[PDB]
Amino acid sequence: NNSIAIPTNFSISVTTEVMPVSMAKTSVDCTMYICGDSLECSNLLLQY
Amino acid sequence: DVLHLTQDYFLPFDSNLTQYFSLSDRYTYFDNPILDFGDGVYFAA
Ligand SMILES: *[C@@H]1O[C@H](CO)[C@@H](O)[C@H](O)[C@H]1NC(C)=O
Numbered sequence: 001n002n003s004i005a006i007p008t009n010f011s012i013s014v015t016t017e018v019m020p021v022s023m024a025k026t027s028v029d030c031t032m033y034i035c036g037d038s039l040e041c042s043n044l045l046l047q048y
Numbered sequence: 049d050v051l052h053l054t055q056d057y058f059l060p061f062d063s064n065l066t067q068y069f070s071l072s073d074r075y076t077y078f079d080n081p082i083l084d085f086g087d088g089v090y091f092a093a
Pocket residue numbers: 062063064
């Protein structure tokens with residue numbers, strides 16, 4: 001109740017922090033993935 | 049009142065059509081040859 005701790009010297013420290021910001025933008029085509037080059041599959045896909 | 053799209057036999061837009069001449073009112077060899085039906089024909093006269 002009558003003792004304190006006061007520092008007499010100091011230091012300067014540099015710390016690194018890595019943070020993500022963005023990710024890859026992906027585009028997906030329903031044609032040439034589901035049916036490929038197939039007109040028979042492409043005819044049935046028009047209802048979706 | 050719908051926006052319907054379909055796959056069928058159609059005449060393509062901005063396509064080139066052959067011109068044939070017809071009009072005894074027949075001055076410049078007006079005649080008709082045998083043409084090709086194919087899978088569908090558009091006839092405008
Ligand atoms: C007419 O159109 C067809 C198909 O677009 C093409 O192949 C042809 O060369 C054209 N002819 C002329 C004279 O432009």
